[PDB]
Swiss-Prot record:
Residues 1-64 are annotated as: Sufficient for interaction with PRKRA. Transmembrane segments: none annotated. Required for formation of the RNA induced silencing complex (RISC). Component of the RISC loading complex (RLC), also known as the micro-RNA (miRNA) loading complex (miRLC), which is composed of DICER1, AGO2 and TARBP2. Within the RLC/miRLC, DICER1 and TARBP2 are required to process precursor miRNAs (pre-miRNAs) to mature miRNAs and then load them onto AGO2. AGO2 bound to the mature miRNA constitutes the minimal RISC and may subsequently dissociate from DICER1 and TARBP2. May also play a role in the production of short interfering RNAs (siRNAs) from double-stranded RNA (dsRNA) by DICER1. (Microbial infection) Binds to the HIV-1 TAR RNA which is located in the long terminal repeat (LTR) of HIV-1, and stimulates translation of TAR-containing RNAs. This is achieved in part at least by binding to and inhibiting EIF2AK2/PKR, thereby reducing phosphorylation and inhibition of EIF2S1/eIF-2-alpha. May also promote translation of TAR-containing RNAs independently of EIF2AK2/PKR. Mediates recruitment of FTSJ3 methyltransferase to HIV-1 RNA, leading to 2'-O-methylation of the viral genome, allowing HIV-1 to escape the innate immune system. The gene is TARBP2. The chain holds residues 28 to 96 of 366 of the full protein. This is RISC-loading complex subunit TARBP2. It comes from the Eukaryota. Residues 3-64 form the DRBM domain. Belongs to the TARBP2 family.
Length: 64
């Protein structure tokens, strides 16, 4: 019952690529970029966590 955020977190730390999030846009709509080592993608959402959730989901699908 773990979320993409915690999954990305756990995987990332195991392979030496702990995810880092950067708030890009806050206009409410938030745009966050997540970076996992060399890989990066963006996600948007109604709240900071919601946006980090989307970014993580995408990076998770791509990586694995």
């Amino acid at each position: 019952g773990k979320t993409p955020i915690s999954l990305l977190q756990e995987y990332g730390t195991r392979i030496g690529k702990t995810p880092v999030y950067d708030l890009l846009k806050a206009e409410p709509n938030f745009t966050f970029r997540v970076t996992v080592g060399d890989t990066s993608c963006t996600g948007q959402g109604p709240s900071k966590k919601a946006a980090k959730h989307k970014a993580a989901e995408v990076a998770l699908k791509h990586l694995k």
